[PDB]
Structures are given as structure tokens and as C-alpha cells.
Amino acid sequence: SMSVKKPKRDDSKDLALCSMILTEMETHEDAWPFLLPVNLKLVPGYKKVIKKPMDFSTIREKLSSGQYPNLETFALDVRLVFDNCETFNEDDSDIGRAGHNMRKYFEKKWTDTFK
Numbered sequence: 001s002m003s004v005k006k007p008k009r010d011d012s013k014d015l016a017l018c019s020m021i022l023t024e025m026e027t028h029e030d031a032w033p034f035l036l037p038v039n040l041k042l043v044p045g046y047k048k049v050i051k052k053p054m055d056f057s058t059i060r061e062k063l064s065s066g067q068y069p070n071l072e073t074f075a076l077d078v079r080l081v082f083d084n085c086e087t088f089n090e091d092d093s094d095i096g097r098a099g100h101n102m103r104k105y106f107e108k109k110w111t112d113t114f115k
Helices: 012-026 029-034 056-064 071-088 095-114
Strands: none
Touching: 012 029, 012 071, 012 095, 029 056, 029 071, 029 095, 056 071, 071 095
16 A cells, blocks of 8 residues: 555566567477467458457567566466467367467466566
């Protein structure tokens, strides 16, 4: 509350560390469905169904340009990529499986880096 703060967590390395995580996600072999925005002209249904499209390149541009106010807003966009994927793809598809794998990979890096 006013003039009453918890001790100050050091957040000065967060930008760099989210960048590194993102690099590792970008270079994973199962990243291919997520590297670029889904082409809304060429994928019937995507535009109407997925209200908030998100992909690694869009996260990279937002990160590089100071559009994440904190590390939680960064995690929310990463998770959105996988939630979108689950919404549009069957679990038993290559892309469906990619999404589960990448989410697992992300969540571990996230815990190990920050928790």
C-alpha cells in the first residue's frame, strides 16, 4: 500500500533473459509452425476463429521495441501462441504435437530461469 513495499526483486536482466528464452524457442526443431504469422488469406477459418493471433516473430518485434511492460506480459504472448495452436489443430497432428512439445519446453525454461 502507500509507503509500504515488499523488497525490490531485481528485474534489470529480464529483457535479456526473455530474449534468450525466445532464441531457444526460435531454434527448436518443432518451432516451424510458430515462426511466422499464420497467413490469414490462405488459411480458411483462422481469421474468424482466432481472435488474437500470435507467433514468435511478432513476439520478437514486440520485445525488441519495448512493447512488453514486464516479464509476465511476455509469457502471456508465448502461451497465447500455444493456446491458439490447440484451438485450431487436432492433438494428433504434426502441428498439434509441435505445440504441446514447445509449450513444455517453454514452461521448463521459464521456471528454471525465473522461479
